[PDB]
Amino acid sequence: GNWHCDSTWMGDRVITTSTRTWALPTYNNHLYKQISSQSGASNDNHYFGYSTPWGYFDFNRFHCHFSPRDWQRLINNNWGFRPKRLNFKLFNIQVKEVTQNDGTTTIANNCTSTVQVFTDSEYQLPYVLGSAHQGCLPPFPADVFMVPQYGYLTLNNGSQAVGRSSFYCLEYFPSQMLRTGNNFTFSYTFEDVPFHSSYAHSQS
Amino acid sequence: QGPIWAKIPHTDGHFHPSPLMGGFGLKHPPPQILIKNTPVPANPSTTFSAAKFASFITQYSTGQVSVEIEWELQKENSKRWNPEIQYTSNYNKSVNVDFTVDTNGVYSEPRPIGTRYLTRNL
Amino acid sequence: GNWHCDSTWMGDRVITTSTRTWALPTYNNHLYKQISSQSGASNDNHYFGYSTPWGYFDFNRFHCHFSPRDWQRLINNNWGFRPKRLNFKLFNIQVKEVTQNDGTTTIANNCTSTVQVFTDSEYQLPYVLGSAHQGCLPPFPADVFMVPQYGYLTLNNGSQAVGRSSFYCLEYFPSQMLRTGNNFTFSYTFEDVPFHSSYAHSQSLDRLMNPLIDQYLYYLSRTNTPSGTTTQSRLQFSQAGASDIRDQSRNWLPGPCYRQQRVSKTSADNNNSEYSWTGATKYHLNGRDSLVNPGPAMASHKDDEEKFFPQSGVLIFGKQGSEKTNVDIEKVMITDEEEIRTTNPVATEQYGSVSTNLQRGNRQAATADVNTQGVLPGMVWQDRDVYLQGPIWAKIPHTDGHFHPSPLMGGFGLKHPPPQILIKNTPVPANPSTTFSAAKFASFITQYSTGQVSVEIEWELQKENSKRWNPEIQYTSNYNKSVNVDFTVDTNGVYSEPRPIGTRYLTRNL
Amino acid sequence: GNWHCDSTWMGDRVITTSTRTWALPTYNNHLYKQISSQSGASNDNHYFGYSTPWGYFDFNRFHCHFSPRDWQRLINNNWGFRPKRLNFKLFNIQVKEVTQNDGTTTIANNCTSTVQVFTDSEYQLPYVLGSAHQGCLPPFPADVFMVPQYGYLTLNNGSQAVGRSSFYCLEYFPSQMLRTGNNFTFSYTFEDVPFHSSYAHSQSLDRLMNPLIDQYLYYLSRTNTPSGTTTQSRLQFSQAGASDIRDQSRNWLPGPCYRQQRVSKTSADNNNSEYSWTGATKYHLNGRDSLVNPGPAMASHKDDEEKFFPQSGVLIFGKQGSEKTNVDIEKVMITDEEEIRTTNPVATEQYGSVSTNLQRGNRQAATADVNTQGVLPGMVWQDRDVYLQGPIWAKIPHTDGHFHPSPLMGGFGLKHPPPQILIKNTPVPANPSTTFSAAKFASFITQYSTGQVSVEIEWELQKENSKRWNPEIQYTSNYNKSVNVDFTVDTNGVYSEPRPIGTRYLTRNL
């Protein structure tokens, strides 16, 4: 897979493309874990949920896509804008094995080992995008970023669960197993949404 | 530097579901894209054990990710006579250029930039 | 990918092909960095810009393409040449990971890791080729070379930036990600450019006339005549012939000039003082002075003045192994542009003389030297010669106006020159923490890349058609015995270029 | 005829349309008149010419066509523009007869009386457009304007004519006679001209190099070296890097210059004396001196010298209501050409320095400032910017030669510019005698004409394609509160243009 960042302005459309390098550790040493608020937390701060071994990709900030100059071009010249469609790709996957022995770390490539990827395209998992979390693609294309860990919350009574609380095992979904040399792609179409108002009113 | 979309909660009712942090409310937003390293067990015992494996080869993964978004624009058509407001960089000299790296290679965003510079009548 | 170096001479074309092995480190530990001049630098030396993690390929010297023998073939047999098209290739890419642990370096191949390559074919980046930088493909095909780091300058006020200053992130361009077994190729067509003049004139602009025949025109030959025991003003006129040949009416003027101080290769002839800057020829741009070097094409010296050269008016190359700073004259090779003195003023003398006043009975005629002469109708000139070790092309700056955009260091001015070819090792993060961190990664696997690069250029030739009777000048190796052969390796394997070689051996009439 | 003002932006074109109401008096009481300078005028001010009864339409300023908002749209979004074609219309002609009798003025429409209109489309008349005269279509569409009177100059010796002096009678051309209900139209196609450069360079000509990489070329870095307790002449050479960046070999030269005196917007910095003429930059033509204004394109000032401007080297516009004669600096708007200092010399300093002598043991190197530098091979430059309130085109004089005919006040040099559009009220004799008289009629009915004029110009755009990462400069209105909005009417209905607006906000690399 090749590297694509640029913006393409055509007619009434602007196409933004961003490419970043990412690194994904092993989270939870491969375990799902029940998590909850500390015993001492205030009632307002109680929660119950699960931490999972999975990471997730988040491009839910404008600077993942617009350079500052692109943004300027947008906001000085347009009364409105809105997303239409997107194309997402993972490529140039590398799986690396680390050996810490006798004081010395040695990283070695493992061409055979896989990563698993799926999109929750039926929206069956708790949706944690849209909470303004860190971990998005960084604004500057040369910055390398860590893939954030996926966790979610369900109902709680204090730090405890309730009967209605739900537990999701992500391996209960089909996922693509990706090796070095495998790529992952999907396309998505935004539903019709109102244009964002990129203007200020000149009347009260 | 702000959010783009949010999932509209699946509920009987909602009013004007423009997500309050800003951006586009979506019933069917961009899906969550989940990834994880497949566990690779380390050297097993040569006597069968029913216990789930707890020794794994340390590993991590890296790669590139690309996202392409097509945006639709509504072009400004201002019929006002006088010039309007426009986002502009400063002219004056400075030690660092806004929205650049410094001498240590650290990129920084010095200010928030909204979208509302052009004007329209009510 | 296979190895191709040779030259193919067919009809009026010569195709040159060069292949080299290169190595590309990780620059800036993958970072872009703001850079500027030191706080103490003089105003003339201030700058502001950026260093980038990218490298770039530069084949912008003739010896990247012509062997010495090929160059000889070119310059002895052709009145002109010019680039037509080129083919560029990167192949046999290898990405290597380095592990320094416990005292011991272990290099291992990583077949999966990539390098990124793009050509700036829309010329959206600052164009740093054409500044005569080091880092080009070396002249000797067996030498392995390091890919130079890409950096650029923007506007500065002292060491600071200004609002108009621009910042370019090269990852904002599409680039090919190349693995082991991937190749990179592109082709390029030169725009039409004038043939370089690979000849010297055998006539001087001031001797184009028939020496046997008088002019029908008259010039003012005397302003006074003997009167009784004294003179009286009397204007008198003559038709110029051979004997008064300096006075003949002529149609043309020598080329422009911007005068240079004269220095001697004989140390004793020079003033004992520091004038390398204070005596230098310069231009003045936005409050800063810059050396004019080499400047407008002007002949290096007049007849029999071989030892003299303009202070900043000639290309100067280092001999093999010569150091960077304050080397003695024996360490450098000073080019000589004497062939153009048939048309272009000598760099160290005045253009000529003009009247400064209005003479009359009580006022004598006055004249003044002209030390800078811009272009005049009727002027003709030759551009600076090109050299085997010299630059080939330069990008013509994108401006409203330009005049005769032959780049002053020599070679071909191009509006759309060969594009910059940028390359960098894709960063590979080292072992990450198992707790999420938002900080950008700062631990990477050490690595570098190597591979081969080939460049093929097709050149168009304008064959010599001399109708002169007597033999002409030709570039020739020495016959006599010597310890080392010119343009060869020595006993230690070091290749060296012992002298500059220009193109102007054959002659033509004006 | 209907009213059309708007702008139509489509693809790479913007079509501007302007409509105004005009009034045309009877000029010269229908007579042609010889005119000349007063007997007491200085030789520099003598002239000879003719005043004619004709008026003319002039739309040769950008604000005749672009609203301030349109101009903003243009300059923030485009790297270049240029005129393509135009359509001109006169319509809703009304001819009015005035009767002043017995103290009382009574204006009455005369449907029958005509106006005469012709375009000089063969360019047979002296072309007086392109002299920056008043009388153009006003910037604000609701302002009604008087059609200016056509007059021209021919050769003069003092206040007298010469044999070569020419006299043009405009009735010797065919012209359309227009009544109420008649319209006049013509279309015109601009010749191909370079796009105006609506950008500023983000690089300076003296910083085009890679700051990270040394040159392979050498320059003379030292002329002497320490000897025992004293120095000895020794030439020494260095390869220029970042630290000696002023010394690097370079391919190009800054643009030409013709030096201007420097004046300060701070009154105290200026000499207390009258130098506006004696200190002025001038050219000398046939025994007469003329101010060189604005002259060759040169940057107005160097870094951080905003308060300084060349004496006659910048366009200067009046603020609304500013008077004709000796207004204070607060009454005018002084343009600033600082954006071109990346390529063009500063108007108030020397071009650079050249050697004036030949140094040797007993003679030190000497240099001199260069205050006028004509074009040299390898020079590049930017033309003067254009302004919303500034001129658009000029006719290139019909001459054997010209160089870079970008008109010096700014805009587009045209060999075949928009033709002069001449108009005049047809004289209507008053009551004649009933006895025949051979004398030409001297009693006419008082009348004037009014109507609308529209001009539509299609402009071609070169869209900004900046690949820079950081935001750039953009023309913007002020955010803060104020009593009047810039580029609006005040409480008395007076439109005003508070500042000059150039085109150079976006940036590009060299």
The full DSSP string for C83-105 is EEEEEEEEEEEEEEEEE-GGG--
Residues of A in contact with D77 (CB under 8 A): 77
Structural contact between residues C91 and C100, judged by C-beta atoms closer than 8 angstroms: no
Structural contact between residues C35 and B103, judged by C-beta atoms closer than 8 angstroms: yes
Q: Kindly tell me the sign of the dihedral angle through the C-alpha atoms of D392, D393, D394, D399.
A: positive
Across the interface, of C31, C160, C167, the residue whose CB is closest to B95 is C160
B75 contacts chain A (CB < 8 A): yes
Which of C434, C424, C25, C101 lies closest to A108, judged by CA? C101
Going by the DSSP 8-state scheme, the letter that residue D4 receives in this structure is -
User: Residues of D89-107 as b/e, b for ≥16 C-beta within 10 angstroms?
Assistant: bbbbbbbbeeeeeeeeeee
Cβ atoms within 10 Å of C325's Cβ, excluding its own: 13
Beta bridge partners of C151: C51
Q: Name, in order, each residue with C-beta under 8 angstroms of D408's C-beta and a sequence gap of 6 or more.
A: D294, D295, D296, D297, D384
- Chain C nearest CA to B34, separation (Å): 15
Beta bridge partners of C401: D381
Structural contact between residues A142 and C171, judged by C-beta atoms closer than 8 angstroms: yes
A92 contacts chain C (CB < 8 A): yes
Structural contact between residues A59 and A18, judged by C-beta atoms closer than 8 angstroms: yes
Residues of A in contact with B96 (CB under 8 A): none
Rounded-to-integer distance, Cα D222 and Cα C275, Å: 8
How deeply is B117 buried, as exposed, middle or buried, from its count of CB atoms within 10 A (0-12, 13-18, 19+)?
Answer: buried
Q: Name, in order, each residue with C-beta under 8 angstroms of C502's C-beta and a sequence gap of 6 or more.
A: C75, C335, C339, C385, C386, C387
Cβ atoms within 10 Å of D52's Cβ, excluding its own: 24
Contact D76 B91 (CB under 8 A): no
Q: Give the chain C residue whose CA is nearest to the CA of D249.
A: C293
How deeply is D183 buried, as exposed, middle or buried, from its count of CB atoms within 10 A (0-12, 13-18, 19+)?
Answer: middle
* Strand ranges inside C166-294, DSSP E: 176-178, 184-189, 196-197, 199-201, 218-227, 230-239, 257-258, 262-264, 282-285, 288-291
* Strand ranges inside C385-482, DSSP E: 393-395, 401-402, 412-414, 420-425, 447-463
Rounded-to-integer distance, Cα D348 and Cα D502, Å: 21
Distances in Å between the Cα of D9 and the Cα atoms of C298, C412, D346, D486 are: 51, 40, 37, 24
Structural contact between residues C291 and D237, judged by C-beta atoms closer than 8 angstroms: no
Cβ atoms within 10 Å of B101's Cβ, excluding its own: 24
Q: What is the rounded radius of gyration, in angstroms, for the C-alpha atoms of chain B?
A: 25
Strands A78-99, A106-109: pairing is antiparallel
Q: What is the largest CA-CA distance in chain A?
A: 73
Q: The tokens of D225 are what? A: 């070296």
Contact C161 B92 (CB under 8 A): no
Rounded-to-integer distance, Cα D302 and Cα D310, Å: 11
Rounded-to-integer distance, Cα D200 and Cα D213, Å: 27
3-state secondary structure of B89: coil
Structural contact between residues D87 and D421, judged by C-beta atoms closer than 8 angstroms: no
Rounded-to-integer distance, Cα C510 and Cα C179, Å: 56
Cα C50 from chain centroid (whole Å): 24
Three-state secondary structure readout of D68-136 = HHHHHHHHHHEEEEEEEEEEEEEEEEEEEEEECHHHCCEEEECCCCCEEEEEECCCCCCCCCCCCCCCC
Rounded-to-integer distance, Cα C145 and Cα C133, Å: 14
Q: The tokens of C189 are what? A: 């067509």
Q: The tokens of C40 are what? A: 């103490």
Across the interface, of C31, C160, C429, the residue whose CB is closest to B105 is C31
Structural contact between residues D286 and C443, judged by C-beta atoms closer than 8 angstroms: no
Q: Kindly tell me the sign of the dihedral angle through the C-alpha atoms of D502, D503, D504, D505.
A: positive
Find tokens 């001449």 and name the residue: D422
List the subunits that have 3+ CB pairs under 8 angstroms with D.
Answer: A, B, C
Across the interface, of A6, A72, A77, the residue whose CB is closest to D472 is A72
Structural contact between residues C494 and C461, judged by C-beta atoms closer than 8 angstroms: no
Can you give the length of chain D in residues?
510
Across the interface, of B97, B104, B105, the residue whose CB is closest to C161 is B97
3-state secondary structure of C452: strand
The D residues from 258 to 317 touching C (CB cutoff 8 Å) are: 299, 302-305
Rounded-to-integer distance, Cα A37 and Cα C263, Å: 83
A38 contacts chain D (CB < 8 A): no
3-state secondary structure of B118: strand
**Dihedral, D461, D465, D468, D470 alpha carbons, nearest 10:** 70
Contact D470 A77 (CB under 8 A): no
Which of D504, D300, D307 lies closest to C163, judged by CA? D504
Q: Kindly tell me the sign of the dihedral angle through the C-alpha atoms of D59, D60, D61, D66.
A: positive
User: Residues of C275-299 as b/e, b for ≥16 C-beta within 10 angstroms?
Assistant: bbbebbbbbbbbbbbbbbbbbbbbb
Strands D412-414, D393-395: pairing is parallel
Contact B88 D479 (CB under 8 A): no
Cβ atoms within 10 Å of C173's Cβ, excluding its own: 22
D216 contacts chain A (CB < 8 A): no
Structural contact between residues A7 and A15, judged by C-beta atoms closer than 8 angstroms: yes
Contact A12 B62 (CB under 8 A): no
Structural contact between residues D276 and D270, judged by C-beta atoms closer than 8 angstroms: no
Rounded-to-integer distance, Cα D426 and Cα D470, Å: 62
Rounded-to-integer distance, Cα C293 and Cα C283, Å: 10
Give the resolution to one decimal, in Å. Answer: 1.9
Residues of C in contact with B103 (CB under 8 A): 33-36
Structural contact between residues D238 and D244, judged by C-beta atoms closer than 8 angstroms: yes
Residues of B in contact with A90 (CB under 8 A): 35, 63-65
Residues of A in contact with B82 (CB under 8 A): none
Structural contact between residues C404 and C396, judged by C-beta atoms closer than 8 angstroms: no
Rounded-to-integer distance, Cα C215 and Cα A128, Å: 97
Across the interface, of A17, A54, A86, the residue whose CB is closest to B35 is A54
Distances in Å between the Cα of D171 and the Cα atoms of C298, D26, D152, D384 are: 58, 15, 15, 38
Helix or strand (DSSP H, E) at C366: none
List the subunits that have 3+ CB pairs under 8 angstroms with C.
Answer: A, B, D
Cis peptide, bond prior to residue B3, ω within 30 of zero: no
Which of D72, D75, D76 to mutate to probe the A interface, most A CBs <10 Å? Answer: D76
C430 contacts chain B (CB < 8 A): no
Beta bridge partners of D178: D115
- Residue D294 exposure: Cα atoms within 13 Å on the Cβ side: 29
Contact C34 B91 (CB under 8 A): no
Cite the DSSP H helix spans in D348-482: none
Q: Give the chain A residue whose CA is nearest to the CA of B100.
A: A140
Residue A76 has φ and ψ, to the nearest 5°, of -80, -20
**Dihedral, C162, C163, C168, C172 alpha carbons, nearest 10:** 160
Structural contact between residues D63 and D136, judged by C-beta atoms closer than 8 angstroms: no
C163 contacts chain B (CB < 8 A): yes
3-state secondary structure of D505: coil
Can you give the length of chain A in residues?
204
Q: Give the chain D residue whose CA is nearest to the CA of C44.
A: D246
Strands D308-310, C33-36: pairing is unpaired
Opening angle at CA D427, ends D425 and D429, nearest 5: 155
Contact D471 A77 (CB under 8 A): no
Find tokens 């426009």 and name the residue: B86
Report helix, strand and coil shares of chain A as percent, to nearest 5.
10, 45, 45
Across the interface, of A107, A145, A148, the residue whose CB is closest to C430 is A107
Cβ atoms within 10 Å of C194's Cβ, excluding its own: 11
Contact A98 C434 (CB under 8 A): no
Contact C99 A109 (CB under 8 A): no
Q: After which residues is chain A broken (C to N over 2.5 A)?
A: none
Beta bridge partners of D9: D14
Rounded-to-integer distance, Cα D296 and Cα D384, Å: 8
- Terminal Cα distance for chain D, rounded: 48
Cα C189 from chain centroid (whole Å): 21
Residues of B in contact with C32 (CB under 8 A): 101, 105, 107
3-state secondary structure of D214: coil
Opening angle at CA C405, ends C401 and C410, nearest 5: 155
Rounded-to-integer distance, Cα A130 and Cα B27, Å: 12
Contact D76 A72 (CB under 8 A): no
Cα A122 from chain centroid (whole Å): 17
How deeply is A167 buried, as exposed, middle or buried, from its count of CB atoms within 10 A (0-12, 13-18, 19+)?
Answer: exposed
Structural contact between residues D7 and D16, judged by C-beta atoms closer than 8 angstroms: yes
Rounded-to-integer distance, Cα B46 and Cα D194, Å: 83
Cβ atoms within 10 Å of A6's Cβ, excluding its own: 18
